Design a protein around this nucleic acid. Structure first.
Ligand SMILES: [Zn+2]
Lengths: 71, 101, 132, 221, 217, 129, 56, 25, 83
RNA sequence: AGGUCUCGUAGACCGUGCACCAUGAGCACG
RNA sequence: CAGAUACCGUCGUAGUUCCGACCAUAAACGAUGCCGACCGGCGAUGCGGCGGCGUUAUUCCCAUGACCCGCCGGGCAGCUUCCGGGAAACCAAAGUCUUUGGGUUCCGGGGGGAGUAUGGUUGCAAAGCUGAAACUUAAAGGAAUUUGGCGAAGGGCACCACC
RNA sequence: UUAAAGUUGCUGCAGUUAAAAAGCUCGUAGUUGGAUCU
């Protein structure tokens, strides 16, 4: 740290709180928007109903077509 | 990256320098950034000095000189061959070139 | 032109630095000397070697040496080194002494000597010619 | 088959007049040929190639690829060294790196942890090393701990004599040459540290170029 | 130099110093030369204390005679005023002279023909001969320099303060350094001078040589 | 402005130790500088030192000796327990076989070694090794 | 004193590339190239084409 | 595409969107 | 370096500088084994006595070592005190 | 009383200025 | 010009000028917060002070202004380096940092989305401050070498170039 | 989710050029405060 004083701790704690809040993975893990926008809803596995079968194209160096299912 | 120790000018404690206009161009260049040309010439130099010398009513009449000062923009200075570019180690020579002619 | 290559020059410096006592200043003598002491498979190479040997011999007898060393210690200037002049060129009866170094010698080991004299301070105006 | 010395130090080594390389390191005499090392030290010199990597510069002839080889040499109860050589062919680079590592070896001293009993095992203090942006720390360890590190400075530390250490690295460790050079610099700075038991006033013996002047004036020309 | 009164200014060494102009140096002062100086004279010339110069010369002569092999002393001169002096010094004491164009890697490249191993190095001027000093820094080689007031001080262990633009002072100090070395070695008695010629160490211009041989018989 | 005379003085003597100088000059003076350098004096790291006492805050001239690696100071003055002393010297001193750390005992200014056998502790000053 | 080999033709690929090793001194000009080096050119038959071998 | 004219076009788009919002309400 | 059992288990001790009391590494090639000779008290001739001094490389390359030689010689007694 | 003072050489610029530039179908081998 | 509502030329509104009322944005950059301590040299510059041969406002005497030789303190700056640092450009600070703590404000966490949406706030307006998310990506970037490529500047050679 | 992350840095990160010091200044809280008393 830089602000180095004996009788100060809440300035360091508030600065650490703001710098930890100003992150990416901590902001994803500690907000409800990332869990709301997740299709699984925070679950490892989920069940669904197959309704379409389609085929998507691959990227530019790798030339193939992949079989995928709309669920 | 950083090219020169200074910034292409001589401003060190000013911040703002009164801009001037170019001669060939009309660029608003700052005064310490523009290349300054001060040339001392006369009215006639070699093709008419003797022709005036035996056509003057005053003997030993010295020809008057013309004194002008030129301000050059950097693009106009390179384009008119006034100043060239050197290498990395040879850039830090503040001495003028030897004016032999 | 007649600019010769490195191998004839290197042979010439080697044979000059190795042989100086039996080496002469005549071209046809040192041609046969170089044929007696060295093996050359050509003929124009012999001619170039002997010509460069003669040129460097006349160059080293003309004046100072700068390209090679000396083993005979260049006797044409060593004899001039061996002359001892009758005057020592340092024991002058009058030596120009500034009074500042005179007062420096008042306190070191000496007083006033016969060869020491005091001159008035010759400062006219200044020093340090204008450069900055 | 038989090595001919080209230096005065090599001549005194080959004359069996000098006893060991201990006083050569004491007087900090430089070594320029790879025969003092295997003349004094025996067959304990173990070599391990570290990494062979290609470097290239491009011309009209495509690009010219050269190989840089890292190797380490040194006995397992004593000295250690490192060498870098770049050449065209791989085995020539290996032999050149082996020679250049054999020239550049350094002595180390080993300290204790708590009690000064038995043979020394760990580093005497906390030394460091710098190469580029690679920072290597050498924390001493208690007896019977083992070196905890990346594989390359761990193998340098078992081949360097010691058997227990704690290490910590900061920077771009993935470049093996800078990291190995920083480790070699850190272990080479062991004698460049003041320790309070060495506060006795030093006594100067004769220089190794001085006892045998009459020998060398008629032996070495 | 020794506190005993046997090696001092007797009668005429200071006279030779004042005749050679050794006491005066350059017009610029280095910050390492604040104690090898008496006082600046007028018109900006610095006066060198001759007692300290003699004392440093005695110390350098002690360092020369301290070793026992005369072939391990190497003297260097690349300036045009000092080729003759080191050759006469090497003839006097048996040192190894290098006069003109000291090639780099002489003490480092062990496979070339110009590879010599010295134990003591003497140089004429540190400013013009920085290349032998940085080369000698790569080995365990002490250096002795006849340094000037304006000369920079780096990789120098024994520094003798004197002017170097005058060939007379350089030749005189080389001659008396050889004199002190031969006196302290045990070949020259101090009760009588051994002085064969003080101008034997002097560099002469070719025009002066021409007029000297024209005037002389 | 100047807020700690001990830190500035100790940084100055560290800079002159790295610079190879023989004698230094500390501009201010206090008791704690005198006690800190006399702990070093009794531990043999530093030989002679002097004090130039005028009618103001005096100056200190120290005759240094080449037995010093680095001297450090910790700001602010942290609280040290008896059970936290080994925790400090494990990650502050370069080794446990040498190096000393001093602290403000209620009985004098004194190092950690005697503080271990006097069963006491206090606020910290700095370290030297 | 010196050696030189060169192999031309297809070598692990569709295209043909000239592959060469050098070691030692090589002389290419003058009269003493006539009575020092020895040049041998020979054709080598493969199942995919021919290869040329020149040695000096 | 330098940032100055990109910012100018984005400012014009923002002005158009805002003035559409105030004509709508 | 001594152990508890009482043996010099350190393999060698390196030299210390005589001007700054610093240590000399094994690969620092800018050190000097300086040798200075004395003279007899009655004749000023060679006697055989040496006084060895050692200078580390940073003292050379940093700019001044001759003054350290003067302090060492005045401490030894070769250079007279008046200077 | 003479009549052509002696020696060496860059002393060089100067009605001189140029329109007309858009695009790249791809790309090995161990 | 293929295509100019572009480079170019001739006119030309609002402004460019002043007085008062507004907004608070720049490469507002030394792209380097503030105070204080320590650590090399050199040569000049501007201010104030101090000391010392000599010349001048004509010739003798004082201090004054001009000039020369040093010194002190503050400031804009310049050259060199194994003090040291840095990824390197380079740096007397960007040094005194794993041998990590002098005191104290603001601020950054891959690249976009995006200084965007929304809300608040200020403003007549233009806009200023505060300031996301969804989604997408394995790169985006900083220094420095080798032929390269210049509608970049020079230098050299050639009767398959010229005179 | 933890260590690796000295990539949240209190120990223990960075802010000339890689992400970065408000355009500058004043100023209330909070932070830090010269020497000296056995
Ligand atoms: Zn213009």
């Amino acid at each position: 740290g830089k602000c180095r004083g004996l009788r100060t701790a809440r300035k360091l704690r508030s600065h650490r709180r703001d710098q930890k809040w100003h992150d990416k993975q901590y902001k994803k893990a500690h907000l409800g928007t990332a869990l709301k926008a997740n299709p699984f809803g925070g679950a490892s596995h989920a069940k669904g109903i197959v309704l379409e079968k389609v085929g998507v194209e691959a990227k530019q160096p790798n030339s193939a077509i992949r079989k995928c299912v709309r669920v | 990256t950083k090219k020169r120790r200074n910034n292409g000018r001589a401003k060190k404690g000013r911040g703002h320098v009164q801009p001037i206009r170019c001669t060939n161009c009309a660029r608003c260049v700052p005064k310490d950034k523009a290349i300054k040309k001060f040339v001392i010439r006369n009215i006639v130099e070699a093709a008419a000095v003797r022709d005036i010398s035996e056509a003057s009513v005053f003997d030993a009449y010295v020809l008057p000189k013309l004194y002008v000062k030129l301000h050059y923009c950097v693009s106009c200075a390179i384009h008119s061959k006034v100043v060239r570019n050197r290498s990395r180690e040879a850039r830090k020579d503040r001495t003028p070139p030897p004016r032999f002619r | 032109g007649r600019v010769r290559t490195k191998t004839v020059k290197k042979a010439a410096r080697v044979i000059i630095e190795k042989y100086y006592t039996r080496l002469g200043n005549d071209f046809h003598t040192n041609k046969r000397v170089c044929e007696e002491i060295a093996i050359i498979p050509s003929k124009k190479l012999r001619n170039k070697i002997a010509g460069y040997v003669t040129h460097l011999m006349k160059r080293i007898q003309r004046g100072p040496v700068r390209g090679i060393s000396i083993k005979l210690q260049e006797e044409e200037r060593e004899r001039r080194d061996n002359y001892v002049p009758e005057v020592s060129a340092l024991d002058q009866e009058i030596i120009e002494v500034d009074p500042d170094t005179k007062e420096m010698l008042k306190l070191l080991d000496f007083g006033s000597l016969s060869n020491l004299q005091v001159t008035q301070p010759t400062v006219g105006m200044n020093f340090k010619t204008p450069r900055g | 088959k038989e090595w001919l010395p080209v230096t005065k130090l090599g001549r005194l080594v080959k004359d069996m007049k000098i006893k060991s390389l201990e006083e050569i390191y004491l007087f900090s005499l430089p070594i320029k040929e790879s025969e003092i090392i295997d003349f004094f030290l025996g067959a304990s010199l173990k070599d391990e190639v570290l990494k062979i990597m290609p470097v290239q510069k491009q011309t009209r002839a495509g690009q010219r690829t050269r190989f840089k080889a890292f190797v380490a040499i040194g006995d397992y109860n004593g000295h250690v060294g490192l060498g870098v050589k770049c050449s065209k062919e791989v085995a020539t680079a290996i032999r050149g790196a082996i020679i250049l590592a054999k020239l550049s070896i350094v002595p180390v001293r080993r300290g204790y942890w708590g009690n000064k009993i038995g043979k020394p095992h760990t580093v005497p203090c906390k030394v460091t090393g710098r190469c580029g942006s690679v920072l290597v720390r050498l924390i001493p360890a208690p007896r019977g701990t083992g070196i905890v590190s990346a594989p390359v400075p761990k193998k340098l530390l078992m081949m360097a004599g010691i058997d227990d250490c704690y290490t910590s690295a900061r920077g771009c460790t993935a470049t093996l040459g800078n990291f190995a050079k920083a480790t070699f610099d850190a272990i080479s700075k062991t004698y460049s540290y003041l320790t309070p038991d060495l506060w006795k006033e030093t006594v100067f013996t004769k220089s190794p170029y001085q006892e045998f002047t009459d020998h060398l004036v008629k032996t070495h020309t | 130099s020794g506190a005993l009164d046997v090696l001092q200014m007797k009668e005429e060494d200071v006279l030779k110093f004042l005749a050679a102009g050794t006491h005066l140096g350059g017009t610029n002062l280095d910050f390492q030369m604040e104690q090898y100086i008496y006082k600046r004279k007028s018109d900006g010339i610095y006066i060198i204390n001759l007692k300290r110069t003699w004392e440093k010369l005695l110390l350098a002569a002690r360092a020369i005679v301290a070793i026992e092999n005369p072939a391990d002393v190497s003297v260097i001169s690349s300036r045009n005023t000092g080729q003759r002096a080191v050759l006469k010094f090497a003839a006097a004491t048996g040192a190894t002279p290098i006069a003109g164009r000291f090639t780099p890697g002489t003490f480092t490249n062990q496979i070339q023909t110009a590879f010599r191993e010295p134990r003591l190095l003497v140089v004429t001027d540190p400013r013009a001969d920085h290349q032998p000093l940085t080369e000698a820094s790569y080995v365990n080689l002490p250096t002795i320099a006849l340094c000037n007031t304006d000369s920079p001080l780096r990789y120098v262990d024994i520094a003798i303060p004197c002017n170097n633009k005058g060939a007379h002072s350089v030749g005189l100090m080389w001659w008396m350094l050889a004199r002190e070395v031969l006196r302290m070695r045990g070949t020259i008695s101090r009760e009588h001078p051994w002085e064969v010629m003080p101008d034997l160490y002097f560099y002469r211009d070719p025009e002066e040589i021409e007029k000297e041989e024209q005037a002389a018989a | 402005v100047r807020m700690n005379v001990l830190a500035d003085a100790l940084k100055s003597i560290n800079n002159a130790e790295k610079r190879g100088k023989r004698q230094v000059l500390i501009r201010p003076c206090s008791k704690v500088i005198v006690r800190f350098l006399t702990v070093m004096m009794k531990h043999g790291y530093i030989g002679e030192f002097e004090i130039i006492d005028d009618h103001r805050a005096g100056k200190i001239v120290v005759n240094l000796t080449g037995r010093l690696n680095k001297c450090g100071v910790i700001s602010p003055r942290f609280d040290v327990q008896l059970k936290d002393l080994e925790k400090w010297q494990n990650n502050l001193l370069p080794s446990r076989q040498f190096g000393f750390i001093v602290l403000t005992t209620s009985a004098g200014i004194m190092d950690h070694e005697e503080a271990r056998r006097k069963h006491t502790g206090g606020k910290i000053l700095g370290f030297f090794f | 004193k010196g050696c030189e080999v060169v192999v031309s033709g297809k070598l692990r690929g569709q295209r043909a590339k000239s592959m060469k090793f050098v070691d030692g001194l090589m002389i290419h000009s003058g009269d003493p190239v006539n009575y020092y080096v020895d040049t041998a050119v020979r054709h080598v038959l493969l199942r995919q084409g021919v290869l040329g071998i020149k040695v000096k | 595409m330098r940032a100055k004219w990109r910012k100018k076009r984005m400012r014009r788009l923002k002005r158009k969107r805002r003035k559409m919002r105030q004509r709508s309400k | 370096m001594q152990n508890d059992a009482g043996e010099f288990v350190d393999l060698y001790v390196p030299r210390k500088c005589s001007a700054s009391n610093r240590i000399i590494g094994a690969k620092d090639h800018a050190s000097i084994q300086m040798n200075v000779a004395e003279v007899d008290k009655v004749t000023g001739r060679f006697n055989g006595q040496f006084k060895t001094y050692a200078i580390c490389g940073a003292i050379r390359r940093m700019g001044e070592s001759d003054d350290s030689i003067l302090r060492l010689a005045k401490a030894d007694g070769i250079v007279s005190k008046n200077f």
